[PDB]
Amino acid sequence: TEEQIAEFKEAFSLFDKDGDGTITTKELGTVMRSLGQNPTEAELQDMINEVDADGNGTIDFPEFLTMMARKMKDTDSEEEIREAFRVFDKDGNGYISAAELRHVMTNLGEKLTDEEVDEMIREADIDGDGQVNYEEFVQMMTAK
Amino acid sequence: TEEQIAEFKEAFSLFDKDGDGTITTKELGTVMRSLGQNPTEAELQDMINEVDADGNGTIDFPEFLTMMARKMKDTDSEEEIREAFRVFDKDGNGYISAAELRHVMTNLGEKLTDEEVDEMIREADIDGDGQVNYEEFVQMMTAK
Amino acid sequence: DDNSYMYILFVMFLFAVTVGSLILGYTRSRKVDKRSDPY
Amino acid sequence: DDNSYMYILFVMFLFAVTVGSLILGYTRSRKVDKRSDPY
Amino acid sequence: THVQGRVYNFLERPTGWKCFVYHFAVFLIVLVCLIFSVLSTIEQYAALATGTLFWMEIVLVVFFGTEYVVRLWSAGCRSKYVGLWGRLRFARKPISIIDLIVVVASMVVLCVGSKSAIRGIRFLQILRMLHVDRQGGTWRLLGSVVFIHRQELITTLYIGFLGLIFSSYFVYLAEKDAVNESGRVEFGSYADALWWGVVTVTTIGYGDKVPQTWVGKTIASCFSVFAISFFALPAGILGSGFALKVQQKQRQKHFNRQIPAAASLIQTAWRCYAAENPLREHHRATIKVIRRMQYFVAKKKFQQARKPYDIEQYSQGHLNLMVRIKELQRR
C-alpha cells in the first residue's frame, strides 16, 4: 500500500484542474462530461452525498482515500452482490440462462454496451449450458 | 478446586464484619457503598433475589458457592451473550463498527468508563476495520 | 326551505373532497407502465 | 321534562368514564422520551 | 433549573399517581360546569343556574389564566425551544392554540357581560373538554390510520357519493309531484330528495320522507342495498386499522425494553472479564464478588426482556423452527 498512497493524490485533485485539495464535485460534472458521461445535477449531488463521508463536497481525501480503501471483495460486500442474483432467481439453484441474463443485462438499471454484455456471460457459461451460476461469477468478482 | 474452597469463605462473610455465616444483604448496601457503588435498596433487594437461591437473604453458601461454581464460560451462557450482539446487528455478519460499538458502549444500560470503553474494542478490532465481530469477542470472553 | 341551499352545498362538497383526493392520488402516482412488471 | 336531568347526567358521565380512562392510560405510561428509540 | 423542568413534566406529558388526580379533577370540574350550563336551558330547571355559577366561571377563568402562564413559563426546559423568542413555536402546538382561544375568548365574553351574552359561555365551556386530554395521543392514531388507508376510504366514499348523487335524482324524477297521506308533498325539491339520500344511505331511516309512487320504491330498494354496503365499509376498514397500529406500538415498545437489557449484559460481561487490572490489593478482592453478583441480575433481566413477549402465543408458525436450526448448528 506504500507505493500507491502518493501518486493517487495526483489523480485526486486532477478534476479541479488546479493544485487545491478539492474533490471538486462542481467540477466533476464537467470532468465526467468531458470523459463522455454528462449526468444530471441530481445524480451529481448524489455522488459525494455517499462518496464523501465528511459532507462538504470537496475533500483532501478523508473518504476519497477510504473509497480507494474499500476493496469491495471481502465478505462484507460479497453477499450483497450475491443477493442481486437472488432477485432474479426462479426455481432456485441460480438457474440463470444466457438468454435471461442477456434479457436482464441490456434492459434495466444502467445498461451495458452490447460488446460488453455479449462477452460478460462468456466466462460464466464455460459449460455452454442454460445456467450461468452466481458462484462462477462472484469467483470472477472475487478479485473485484 | 480444592485450593479455593477454603479461603473463599473468608471473603464470603467479610461483608458482615463478623464471624457469622451470613451473606449480609442488609450490610451489602454498606459494603458496596464503601467500595464506591452506593445502589438503591430496590436493586439491592434484587441482588440476593436471584443470587441466593435459598431465599432468606444471608446464607452459609448454598448459592454463594454456586455463584462461584458457575463459570459463565461454557455453552450454556455463551449463546446468551452471543444473542446480545444480535440485538445490535444490522444487515447480518456482525457488522458492528468501532464507532457504533462506542455509541452503544457509553450510552445504554450500565455504562463503562471512557478508559474502559476506549480500549474495550481494541483487541476486537485488530484488523483496524469497521467490523468488531462477535466471534472475536466471545473468544476473548471464552475465558470469562 | 329557508336555508335549504346548505344541504346541497355540503353533500356536493364532501363528494368534491373525495374525488379531489382520488385525483391527487392518481397524479402524485409514480409511473404508468402497463406491462413491465414481471419481465 | 319531569326527570330530564337524568339524560344529561348519564351522557356526560359516560364521556367522563372514557376521558378518565384516557388520562389513566397517559399517566400510568412509562416514559416520554421522544427521539431515543432507534438509536 | 430543577423547579421549571419539574413543573413542565407535571403540567405537560404528566406522570405519577398525583398528576392523574390533578388533571382528571380539573376535567371533572369542567364536566360539572358544562352539565349545569346545559341544564340552564330546560325552562323548568333553569332556577338552579344562579349568579354563583357565573362567579364560579370567573374564578375558573382566573385559574386558567394563570395555568396557561405557568405552562408557558415552564416551557424553557425543552431542547426544541428556549428563552422567550423560541417559546413562540411552543404556542404553535394546536392544543395550546385551542387553550389560548378558550381562556382569552371566555374572559372577553365574561367582561362584556359584567359591565345572547350567557349563550356564548356554553360553547367556550364545551371547548374546555378538549384541552385537558393532553399529548394528542388519540388524534395521532386516527390521523395515521386514515392516512394509511387513504386508498380504500377515498374509493368507497367516491362510489357511495356517486350512488347517492345519481340514484337520489331518479327518485326526485319519480316523485316530483305526489302528495303524502296528510296532504303535503315530500320530495318537493332536489334537496329534499338528497336529505333522503343521505338519510337512507346511512341507514337511519327517520321516516319523514318515504317514496310513495311505486317506481321510486324500486329505485330506493336498489340504491339501498348497493350503497348501504359501500357506506358500511369504513367501519370494518378502520376497525382493522386501529387494532393493527396498537400492535405495531407494542412491538417497538417491547423492542425499546429489550435494548437496555441487551446492553446491561455485554457491558457487565466485559466488566467480569476485566478482573486482571481495573495497599491496592484487598480493594480488588471485593470487586470480584460484585462483578459476578450483578452479572446474574443482568442475566435475569435479559431473559425477562425476551421471554415475556406481549397475544403472547405468536410462536405458532415457528414452533419447532427455532430449535431445528440450533440442534443442526450443534452438529
Ligand SMILES: [Ca+2]
Ligand atoms: Ca473546490
Ligand SMILES: [Ca+2]
Ligand atoms: Ca467534505
Ligand SMILES: [Ca+2]
Ligand atoms: Ca446476617
Ligand SMILES: [Ca+2]
Ligand atoms: Ca437464604
